[PDB]
Symmetry: D2
Subunit: 154 residues, 4 copies
């Protein structure tokens, strides 16, 4: 007595960047409210993006990249106001791997970034008008190798 009412999966945009050790995915039920970027290096010189931590209130969270031995030295915290609708950045070599090196998040009312080392090959994830980004997925290893987003209407 159980009708098979097909369950849905959100549209995807990307991934951009490069193949990495592990596929990762994080689409939480509630909106993303915070993104922490972790780096090695320093702002006065060059920041090396190593991992990204995505979270949604009150406790959903995931960290991708950062599984290597390099110690972190800096972090940038992005407090998301509203729905993300676009992301951009640069891809370039880091210790033998082409990785996400800088990232910028854009919502309906504000832009955050770009943060990191903004040099390299640009990437841009954009979605249809009237849609929102509701999660991210990609590949990662010691660093963040590729990134894509889940999106849906309204």
């Amino acid at each position: 007595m159980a009708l098979q009412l097909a369950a849905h999966s959100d549209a995807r945009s990307g991934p951009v960047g490069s193949n990495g050790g592990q596929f990762w995915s994080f689409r939480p039920v509630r909106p993303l409210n915070k993104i922490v970027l972790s780096f090695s290096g320093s702002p006065d010189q060059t920041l090396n993006l190593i991992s990204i931590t995505f979270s949604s209130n009150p406790t959903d969270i995931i960290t991708v990249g950062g599984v290597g031995p390099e110690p972190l030295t800096y972090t940038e915290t992005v407090n998301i106001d509203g729905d993300i609708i676009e992301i951009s950045g640069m891809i370039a070599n880091y210790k033998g791997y082409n990785v996400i090196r800088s990232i910028k998040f854009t919502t309906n009312k504000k832009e955050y970034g770009p943060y990191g080392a903004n040099a390299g090959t640009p990437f841009n994830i954009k979605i249809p008008d009237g849609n929102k980004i509701v999660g991210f997925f990609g590949n990662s290893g010691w660093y963040v190798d590729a990134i894509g987003a889940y999106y849906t209407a309204k």
Copy 2:
């Protein structure tokens, strides 16, 4: 030299049914305009769905199911008028496997079906208002084991 503008993949609904021998996927760039359902048995008795052939003019086409030796004895040709917005049917046993046994296609203009043996466990692939089905995917072997749909805004 070339912006990595993330490319999109349409949302999915399903699949419903059962795991089968091969995954299959068909999402043409022009509308799906014809579907041929091939069966063994008799329309005057019981029809057994063996394969489905989806096509989009001028020459896009795919057949899933039917790789077994059983001869086909009857076909139902469905000429699609309008956007497909819903699919439903029944899943039941056929020669050792739970398979898609009947299927009904609903568009914004007409309803087609159910075609086949309308007995078993019901399935229904429904999408949000304002969207349309633009492709199908599933699993198949000798028969049609599972089916799901790709959908996007109209």
Copy 3:
């Protein structure tokens, strides 16, 4: 001129269950090592699965289901030993929705469950030999409507 070295997304199994309010996805880069199932009702009587919390050390976590007004009364904490290789359970109606009602996790070393109300329509998420489940996805609302898994070799 970063090479576009196509990045991979793991093979998927499912989902099973039914369409729900939101799509959710959680595939961490480290192994899933803990799953908390939250229920209303009681073990001595009938346990009603409401939400599931998946986590991977040290800090990855996600909770799906549980959005509604019903208070939680019991939880089953599963400490996963080994790679998850199979999941099974039952789907049945709960307050007007067909939902995941029980779930059993099988790793290469032990099995856990089934936990919940083991009655209704059985489901089984199986993968090819030599593979392991590395994440889960599905639909959820007030309850856990559908679930599927990400899997990969080894």
Copy 4:
């Protein structure tokens, strides 16, 4: 009654390229064994990849790109022997869009190509050892904007 034996969807690699008008997908149940690349331009000067026709000759076929007004002037027909294990090529601007401009296919038996214009930025779809490409997906419009592959073991 029907046991919900979760059905599987093959792993994906990509897409590489750029977002385009429509998502397309083709994963036939029989091995892909024919690919036709259609161009405008001159084999001596520069070829402009307009569309690609993939087939599981002779039953399954799809053509992506080429829905615009530009006439084709030259085609490359590729008869694949064995399993495709890798593809690579260049991406570059064509009349306002960054599109797939050349492609080279590698099977366990031999190499095919490159076919197209050798200029732009490179892409490469590689898969795990012991796997094979069993389908393709991407974005397209007047041209082939993005491409990715479905792969599985064996």
